[PDB]
Amino acid sequence: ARPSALHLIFERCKLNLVEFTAQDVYQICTTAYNMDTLGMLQDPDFMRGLHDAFRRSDQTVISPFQANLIADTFRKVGINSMPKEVSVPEEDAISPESLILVLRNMNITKQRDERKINEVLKLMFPILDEFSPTQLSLTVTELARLKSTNADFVGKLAKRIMEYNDDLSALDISSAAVSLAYCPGISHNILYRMMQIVEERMGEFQPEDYINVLHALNTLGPKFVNTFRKIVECGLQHVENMDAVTLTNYMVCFSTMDYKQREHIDIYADALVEVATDLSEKDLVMAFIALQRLRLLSDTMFGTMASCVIRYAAKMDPRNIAPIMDICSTVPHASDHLMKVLMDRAVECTRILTANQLGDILDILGLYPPAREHPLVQLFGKQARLRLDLMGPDALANATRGLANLGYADPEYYAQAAETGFRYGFKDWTLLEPMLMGLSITGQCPPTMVRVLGSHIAPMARSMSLMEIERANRYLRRLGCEDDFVYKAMASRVLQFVKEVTPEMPEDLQVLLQRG
């Protein structure tokens, strides 16, 4: 209900009859987001007028995040809005502050422009000396967020930052380290010197500093393992009380570095699984993966981690079903309940899984005994038949192998898979075996298909071992190939690795020997 004065002001704002500056629209939007008494968000004819007022105003007065907030509060209602792009300063508008603001505007409002980045960099170089120490760190952070490829300027900035080592604090040092590690093309000399500086001032570090340093070392790689050593020694006296995210980062760095002093690994994992219940979904997934990769999943380890992950198992993200599914394999521990809940969740989201994820899930469930008697096999078969157009060779091989191992019988799907695999040739034997496995379930195929299959398998018989030779022979006999060049090629290899025939020789091989 709008009284007379309120209604008249609403009408005046509705008719675009009032000139609004950026500050006033920001204040009104803040009031609306804070309090909903007058129903500002419930009048489309009012927020539409406010949006029209916002478009035709000078947005350069307010800070970048204020413009981003107005855009977000208009997007939430249902109006597609985007703050205007800032122009590069020209002539005397040149200053360090405006050149930082251009990057900040491009960062916050999600409007990345490589041409404007290049223009700004080509104009900030001469005055690099005038820059203050904090502005250098801000520029490094902004360039790291924008994924700029101009590693030379970032290196120059990093050198000028190192020249003021005394001025900078622990937080600035950590921010510079991580922002340098994120740039791909940075020279390794500057990286070595920056990690050397991080190596000292080690006791001053805070949990945020520890997280930044561990992120940088995970990004960098084994080449800096030595520095990481002094980190794990440094935290050996605080390990009994650390944040769960810090211990997860420690496990990730342990897995990446291929650390080999096992006592530190065991102590840190033991400290982690005490407070593992505080981890988010993503961090829990990565703790599980890192622990698996280090060969540390004992019985209690796996039990505790599975109990912690079963909570998020109800609403798992699609990207997180496959990794835990893999971890549940390759371990001799009971994980029936986790498997069942994960399979149910996988069934729930069968219409949003990409081709690669569907192939991975079918591969992981291929040999699972309790996965045959489930609706997932049929649902995933239909989904794979639909998605065969979007599947690469690896995804095709994975899905077809998983379906063949699961007992799914559908001749049309296997014929279509064989055609799609004939579109792009099979590079490896592992990429071709699933097609044979699928086609051998029914036991028949058109003669042209078996001829093309024989033509493909014939060159690959030169390098496969005896077991592969036997499997290929079995599949070819099941399909019914008559081509002689194949059988001849398979025969020769057999002889080379087995000299001449013998009564002892297996009958099938002896037949294979006859080049039927």
Binding site: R112, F422, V452, S455
Partner: protein, 452 residues
């Protein structure tokens, strides 16, 4: 559909396009995809280059023009972030921008052309074929990029890194661009010969069609193609029979042993012939020059039951081919004339002139088609050559048309190209017919040019 993010929308749009351009054109999938893509926006969300390229491609494929918002937002993103468009999503962007004809589309296509020119040496088997096909979709004349890509294709094909589908795609892409290179096509033919049994009929017919279209004038490979195709006749479909008819008319060499078997197989499947197949076969017979009445009677009879299926192109080709060979079919001619009168607004610039001349050459005048074609000539006068303008003017004079609103455009066009108009000897007789009707009063300057 609201809970789907932009990435899932892009994936499902690609799925819908793949289902529609391959497994039927169900008018339901197209309209659902149009409705979904009409209410999507890339605004305020961080997206990969591949997802934006997929959205742009699937939007443009479904009719969306260069005025739509989604298209504008994707084009702006492709302009601003150029180094994020790697060699994997270059073909998608180029294919999407092929049909869009504006300033931004031209700029993006040029930038991607230069990027592919620089990195032409580091591509692999998939990338060369995808990029060359995508650049064949758009009409561009970057010769240096084509030379680099052909060199890389030869280097890859020497070691044998191409399949049957790759060979068909490469042959069609290089034939569509009119890039005549003998070594590249020799290498493609040799790669197919090495493939041997891995090429089936469905992957063999387009190879022959493209190899004939490029026009290498090499009689060594035409005979080999004919011999290879001679074994596969019994497995062919009617569309494939018409395709080889057209291809071996394009080659220009006479192979009687092949033409006889092709004719027998075409007669066998006479009930499966549509109007397009009949028009293609008659055009191929006109081009090659052979005169075979036995097949012609069956083709004409089957064309009589599918009159309603005829397009403008099919009517034009069929009527011209029938008139060249001097075949008389009064019922077929009358039905074709009426149908052409019904769809007179579907004739292109040259199809109209060919149809009118073919109808006028034989003594068959019908007012229904005459009025429609004469009225439609105004909108195609401006896209005509000198000889085509002469043919249209003669056909119009045969129809006894005197409306100035029709005759002013054609006279203007023939006056603008008078030199080539009066320098073609084969039409000289036609000239003396035209001014035998209109007389010196009609367009005196043309008469003064004629006297000189």
């Amino acid at each position: 559909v609201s809970h789907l993010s932009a990435r899932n929308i892009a994936t499902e749009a690609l799925q819908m396009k793949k289902l529609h351009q391959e497994r039927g054109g169900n008018p339901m999938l197209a309209q659902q995809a149009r409705r979904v893509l009409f209410a999507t926006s890339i605004a305020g969300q961080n997206l990969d280059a591949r997802s934006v390229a997929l959205l742009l491609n699937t939007a443009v494929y479904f009719g969306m023009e260069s005025d739509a918002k989604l298209v504008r937002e994707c084009i702006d993103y492709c302009l601003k972030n150029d180094k994020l468009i790697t060699v994997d999503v270059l073909p998608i962007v180029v294919t999407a921008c092929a049909t869009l004809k504006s300033r931004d589309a031209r700029e993006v296509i040029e930038m991607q052309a230069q990027k592919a020119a620089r990195n032409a040496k580091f591509l692999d088997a998939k990338d060369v074929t995808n990029i060359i096909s995508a650049f064949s979709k758009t009409g561009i004349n970057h010769e240096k990029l084509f030379a680099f890509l052909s060199r890389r294709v030869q280097t890859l094909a020497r070691v044998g890194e191409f399949e049957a589908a790759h060979l068909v795609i490469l042959a069609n892409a290089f034939s569509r661009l009119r890039y005549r290179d003998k070594f590249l096509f020799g290498a493609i033919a040799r790669r197919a010969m090495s493939l041997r049994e891995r090429v089936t009929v469905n992957e063999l017919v387009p190879l022959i069609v493209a190899f004939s279209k490029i026009g290498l004038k090499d009689p060594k490979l035409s005979k080999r193609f004919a011999t290879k195709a001679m074994e596969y006749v019994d497995q062919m479909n009617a569309e494939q029979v018409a395709s080889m008819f057209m291809a071996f008319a394009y080659f220009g060499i006479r192979y009687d042993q092949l033409f006889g078997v092709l004719t027998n197989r075409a007669v066998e499947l006479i009930d499966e012939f549509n109007a397009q197949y009949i028009s293609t076969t008659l055009n191929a017979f006109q081009r090659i020059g052979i005169n075979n009445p036995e097949l012609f009677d069956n083709l004409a009879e089957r064309a009589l039951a599918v009159v309603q299926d005829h397009d403008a192109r099919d009517i034009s080709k069929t009527v011209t081919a029938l008139a060249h060979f001097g075949l008389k079919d009064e019922e077929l001619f009358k039905r074709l004339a009426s149908h052409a009168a019904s769809i007179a607004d579907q004739f292109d610039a040259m199809g109209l002139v060919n149809t009118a001349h073919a109808f006028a050459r034989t003594n068959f005048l019908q007012q229904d088609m005459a009025v429609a074609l004469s009225e439609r000539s105004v909108y195609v006068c401006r896209l005509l050559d000198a000889g085509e303008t002469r043919r249209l003017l003669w056909a119009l004079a045969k129809f006894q048309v005197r409306d100035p609103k029709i005759l002013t455009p054609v006279f203007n066009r023939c006056l603008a190209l008078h030199y080539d108009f009066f320098a073609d000897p084969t039409g000289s007789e036609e000239i003396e017919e035209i001014f035998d009707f209109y007389g010196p009063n009609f367009c005196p300057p043309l008469y003064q040019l004629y006297i000189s």
